[PDB]
Swiss-Prot record, chains A, D:
Changing residue 11 to D: In Windsor; O(2) affinity up; unstable. Changing residue 98 to G: In Nottingham; unstable. Changing residue 115 to P: In Madrid; unstable. Changing residue 69 to S: In City of Hope. The lineage of its organism: Eukaryota, Metazoa, Chordata, Craniata, Vertebrata. GO terms for cellular component: blood microparticle; cytosol; endocytic vesicle lumen; extracellular exosome; extracellular region; extracellular space; ficolin-1-rich granule lumen; haptoglobin-hemoglobin complex. It comes from Homo sapiens. Changing residue 130 to D: In Wien; unstable. Changing residue 117 to R: In P-Galveston. This is Hemoglobin subunit beta.
UniProtKB/Swiss-Prot annotation, chains B, C:
The gene is HBA1. Changing residue 130 to P: In Sun Prairie; unstable. Changing residue 1 to E: In Thionville; O(2) affinity down. Residues 1-141 form the Globin domain. This is Hemoglobin subunit alpha. Changing residue 6 to V: In Ferndown; O(2) affinity up. It comes from Homo sapiens.
């Protein structure tokens, strides 16, 4: 996806302030709570019975860490998301069969977490730039279906 | 189907938003137009630039509709019937666009409710906006 | 909101389908599994090969649910409540998958109703299946 | 998109029997009747007040002809849909701003028309092959959004 330099500026400046041990788990937990069908792919994680159970589940935090690592990865390679996400696409599409609509959903949940954490700093143009990013990631992760 | 917990959560978030609801509606519209530029074609006669009086006034109308929905949560099809007709028949609003505005409304709340926007409340608000959207696309025609 | 015309169209198509509804349900399921292979993961314990007794029996159950819906068209939330619970809470069926099965049900009807599947009836059937889908995703949880 | 030779066989054998003066208008008319928000982009076509008005509208038939021409085009170039659809993507995305969900919808309506016209001949595997095709077209037409 092509971000303008202003869009790139908005995205990278914010991301440098993200707590990379926490934000991934927050986005994953919210994905499981808000869109509870997604709990289908995470039965082994244990107690997912309440929001509190999900958000405090250590497996959710640990796995979210890996997910954010992959977003961090795409951010370093915006002009080659397809290459960056090839093996994850193989995994999410060929092996797991996750519907790619859920990739868009996780991206939007991430956006919500970023807004919650950054407040007024997550301005309408900053969001716009992030929307281009998470759409780019979702599309690359979905490449094995295309 | 909105639960008793959902209804209390949405009521709580409405309360905290308070008299900012109009301003927040305006912000959600700006977020939508910048993030999802396809939506702009529904407002060809608006000036969509930042600080536009038309976007401000519309934000208030949207916020007011959502609060009418909250206040009549158990009778939303009826409360929003005139708006459902408008959005499907006259405006021909593509159903996908309700998800885009709903997402932008959530983002705006998240940006302004550090304490209120918990995972549970985020869930409830999502369900509320999805219910509103379901009503407003119920008409096509 | 299903119109009087929609209700008559869906009734007409049901009538023409007649005693083939079970077989057609089975066909729609096969079309789905082949066209949209992600859907297969919901039936890990079924054998999904052509002529499978499990797909046949399931086709009948689905067709039967749809006919219960037609027969109680003005009270669908109530008629399908047990199924809504099942599909959201236990099965965790992703909402996108309802559009996929709905499309495959339409395709099956189109393949078997040369006279009945007019543009108007196609419309009405789409609305009917969208209404059923809305009920069956109303529960998440 | 990669069709197998069996999938290619299923697709091309059927398409050679399609009435290319009619099927495009049938798919477009049904798109306008079933998904009536799409009438938003076709106000100049005149009377769209009833199904009969739409299906007998001469502008609908004439324009559908061009649409099917483009599907015919993609069918000749399955392994390069992106190149084939570049200028249409520019048009549908940059100039018209059609939400790309409607590309998927038109593809599915086409599938319904094919099933209606071919009956039992439009078998479950034949459909599957066509689904890969119309998804490939929708994705290429949507490239300007990616
Ligand atoms: C927003 C896009 C997504 C990204 C960037 C992402 C990223 C990742 C990463 C980095 C891993 C670790 C792979 C490894 O261990 O080598 C993973 C695994 C996994 N993902 Fe995702 N994911 C996304 C969306 C989703 C969604 C929406 C679901 C289900 C609703 C899902 C289900 C899974 C599952 C079940 C695993 C465990 C795979 C295994 O260990 O066998 N993913 N993902
Ligand atoms: C949460 C969902 C929505 C709510 C509560 C809402 C509410 C409203 C209200 C209250 C009005 C003015 C009613 C009147 O004065 O008669 C309106 C009009 C309008 N809406 Fe929405 N709406 C929603 C979704 C959408 C979406 C998704 C779009 C398109 C992207 C849209 C496009 C329009 C347009 C173009 C008008 C006419 C504006 C004008 O000409 O001044 N609406 N809406
Ligand atoms: C038009 C929409 C649908 C209808 C009318 C329908 C109807 C039904 C019925 C009647 C049953 C059996 C009920 C019982 O015996 O308790 C069932 C079960 C089930 N459904 Fe659906 N359903 C629909 C959509 C879906 C979708 C989209 C999926 C997933 C792709 C799905 C997956 C399942 C599964 C996995 C079962 C359990 C099957 C078994 O273990 O034997 N359903 N459905
Ligand atoms: C399924 C994918 C689609 C294909 C293959 C397709 C194909 C075409 C073609 C071949 C043209 C003629 C362009 C020219 O005259 O050079 C066209 C124009 C047009 N399309 Fe589509 N189309 C698709 C989807 C859609 C949808 C879903 C909509 C709206 C709901 C739409 C709206 C339009 C409009 C308004 C024009 C007239 C453009 C103009 O003359 O300015 N298209 N399309
Ligand atoms: O977000 N699960 O990889
Ligand atoms: O801004 N929705 O009317
Ligand atoms: O096949 N749907 O249960
Ligand atoms: O299908 N309209 O190009």
């Amino acid at each position: 996806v092509h971000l303008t330099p202003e869009e790139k500026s908005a995205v990278t400046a914010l991301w440098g302030k993200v707590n990379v041990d926490e934000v991934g788990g927050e986005a994953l937990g919210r994905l499981l709570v808000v869109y509870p069908w997604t709990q289908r792919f995470f039965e082994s994680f244990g107690d997912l019975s309440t929001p509190d159970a999900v958000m405090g589940n250590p497996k959710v935090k640990a796995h979210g860490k890996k997910v954010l690592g992959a977003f961090s990865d795409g951010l370093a390679h915006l002009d080659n998301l397809k290459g960056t996400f090839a093996t994850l696409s193989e995994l999410h599409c060929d092996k797991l069969h996750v519907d790619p609509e859920n990739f868009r959903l996780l991206g939007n949940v991430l956006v919500c977490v970023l807004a919650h954490h950054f407040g007024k700093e997550f301005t309408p143009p900053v969001q716009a730039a992030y929307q281009k990013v998470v759409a780019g990631v979702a599309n690359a992760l979905a490449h094995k279906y295309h | 189907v909105l639960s008793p917990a959902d209804k209390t959560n949405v009521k709580a978030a409405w309360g905290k938003v308070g008299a900012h609801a109009g301003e927040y509606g305006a912000e959600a519209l700006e977020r939508m137009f910048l993030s999802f530029p396809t939506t702009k074609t529904y407002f060809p006669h608006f000036d969509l630039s930042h600080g536009s009086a038309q976007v401000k006034g519309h934000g208030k109308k949207v916020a007011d509709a959502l609060t009418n929905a909250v206040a009549h949560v158990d009778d939303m099809p009826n409360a929003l019937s005139a708006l459902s007709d408008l959005h499907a028949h006259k405006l021909r609003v593509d159903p996908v666009n309700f998800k885009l505005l709903s997402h932008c409304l959530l983002v705006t709340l998240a940006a302004h409710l550090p304490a209120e926007f918990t995972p549970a409340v985020h869930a409830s608000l999502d369900k509320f906006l999805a219910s509103v959207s379901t009503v407003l696309t119920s008409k096509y025609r």
